[PDB]
Design a protein around this nucleic acid. Sequence first.
DNA 1: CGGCCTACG
DNA 2: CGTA
DNA 3: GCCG
Length: 326
Amino acid sequence: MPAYACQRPTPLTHHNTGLSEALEILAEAAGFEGSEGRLLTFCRAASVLKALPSPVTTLSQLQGLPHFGEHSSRVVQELLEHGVCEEVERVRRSERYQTMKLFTQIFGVGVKTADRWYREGLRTLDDLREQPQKLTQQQKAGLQHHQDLSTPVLRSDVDALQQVVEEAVGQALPGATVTLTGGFRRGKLQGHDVDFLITHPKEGQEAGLLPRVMCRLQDQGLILYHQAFERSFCIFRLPQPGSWKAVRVDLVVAPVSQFPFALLGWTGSKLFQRELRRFSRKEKGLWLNSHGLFDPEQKTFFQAASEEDIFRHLGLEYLPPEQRNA
DNA sequence: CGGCCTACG
DNA sequence: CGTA
DNA sequence: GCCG
Ligand SMILES: Nc1nc2c(ncn2[C@H]2C[C@H](O)[C@@H](COP(=O)(O)OP(=O)(O)OP(=O)(O)O)O2)c(=O)[nH]1
Ligand SMILES: [Ca+2]
Ligand SMILES: [Ca+2]
Ligand SMILES: [Cl-]
Ligand code: NA
Ligand code: NA
């Protein structure tokens, strides 16, 4: 089993779901305390289990697996022997974990803001609503829409939404295209938000496009919240039987020269892309982001026409999106 | 021990 | 600071 | 928390 997640296929569904979900609780709790290193180790250990071909049934089967040291191994052992890990359950019911999770789920609130509110004594959404001068415009929108935004977006919702975006994009710039990215491109049947990548086949024509798209969506009454730019993090009105619901939608524009890098980055998963960028820099000496792949010794950018090109540049076997669920 | 992804709004 |  |  290789040490980087980008070196192994990771399917969406697998054979160690309960074990991985426990390690991801500990990863999340580490993030809430500001230890990104521990978060990464727990995430990586969880992802190793997702990549295995069958269930872990005995502690012996962790020997030699990367990212399983004394702590992650003890978590798995307790789950194998008792069906529960006391450390995980203590985290689950802790006031700190529950409130930090509640607050960071608000659009416009990160770990740093949630922690400050926690230290001030706040614990509930109604606590926040009773002091709204304390809130940015973004946070106000995230709090007002929190209930709808907490409900998963169904893959069955997405095609009708993509059609609406395509209509606005085609008026803004005929010939421009819309590609579904994010977890839905990896095969998920639900998601917390929808991610779209927009480009045009003629290099340079995409300049200035996103403000034109947003203006047209707003004029159609579809934008509940937004605001030169190339990424937009929106709240959209999605139809429902007899009504509608708020949904988070991300829009990104890339020039066609960069489209394979943007498609790769925005298709994720988040851990897969962090691991891929870490691999590129530490193992290959190349710097990767959603715009390109840079050789800092030649001071040259790799041209890519496809995601396949990028995997080849990096010396990695190609993984389709459905196998990037690290 | 150092390092832990890398951007844009 | 927020966001992907 | 773990790798190298
Ligand atoms: N490099 C990098 N990419 C990120 C980061 N956060 C998100 N992304 C990329 C990869 C994600 O798959 C993609 C979309 O992010 P989302 O939060 O929408 O996640 P995703 O669609 O995978 O899942 P979800 O909507 O929760 O089902 O953006 C980050 O911190 N770093
Ligand atoms: Ca998103
Ligand atoms: Ca998403
Ligand atoms: Cl840490
Ligand atoms: Na080990
Ligand atoms: Na948030």
